[PDB]
Amino acid sequence: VNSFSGYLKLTDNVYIKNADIVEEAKKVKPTVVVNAANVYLKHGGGVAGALNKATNNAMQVESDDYIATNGPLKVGGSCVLSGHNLAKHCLHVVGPNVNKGEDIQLLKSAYENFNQHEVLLAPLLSAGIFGADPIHSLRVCVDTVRTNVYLAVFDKNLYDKLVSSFL
Numbered sequence: 658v659n660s661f662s663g664y665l666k667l668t669d670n671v672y673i674k675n676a677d678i679v680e681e682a683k684k685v686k687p688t689v690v691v692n693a694a695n696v697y698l699k700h701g702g703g704v705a706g707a708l709n710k711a712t713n714n715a716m717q718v719e720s721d722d723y724i725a726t727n728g729p730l731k732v733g734g735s736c737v738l739s740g741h742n743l744a745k746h747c748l749h750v751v752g753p754n755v756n757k758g759e760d761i762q763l764l765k766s767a768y769e770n771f772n773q774h775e776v777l778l779a780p781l782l783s784a785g786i787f788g789a790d791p792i793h794s795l796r797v798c799v800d801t802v803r804t805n806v807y808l809a810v811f812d813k814n815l816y817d818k819l820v821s822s823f824l
């Protein structure tokens with residue numbers, strides 16, 4: 658039993674809710690919240706900008722030190738950093754950005770990072786400003802992640818479409 662509430666169950670291990678991931682993180686304080694990161698960990702907008710804003714820019718300060726030491730992430734890769742006031746840990750995962758021409762096949766590699774964590778609160782990778790089809794992203798999630806994932810979908814309209822079209 659865990660503290661996630663109000664989710665619809667899609668599969669054995671995948672759950673979904675219409676929620677603001679920032680507010681969901683603030684209430685649950687999950688072990689892991691996933692950020693929709695880019696390779697530079699520049700948290701300017703989308704999920705990343707909202708998560709970073711909720712940390713009062715502490716996420717960005719920590720991220721800049723990470724990049725200065727380690728260099729950029731790979732598309733499809735991840736790193737574990739602090740969850741600040743939102744979670745124990747933040748798993749920064751880089752899905753491909755269609756608006757930059759990155760290969761959508763890398764979306765499966767991105768979701769594989771979730772399998773290193775038993776339970777996660779996450780957004781749909783490559784959705785929103787990353788330009789992928791969220792229905793495709795949900796399918797890849799279900800077919801790739803084997804650990805327990807709680808998906809927060811900010812837009813109520815998209816949430817309804819994702820549920821109604823789910824196979």
Ligand SMILES: O[C@H]1CC[C@@H](Nc2ncnc3[nH]c4cc(F)ccc4c23)C1
Binds near residue numbers: 677702
């Ligand atoms: O909107 C759709 C497309 C992308 C996906 N993004 C999110 N998913 C879950 N929680 C989210 N909180 C946010 C706060 C923001 F300022 C911006 C985006 C998000 C956001 C859902």
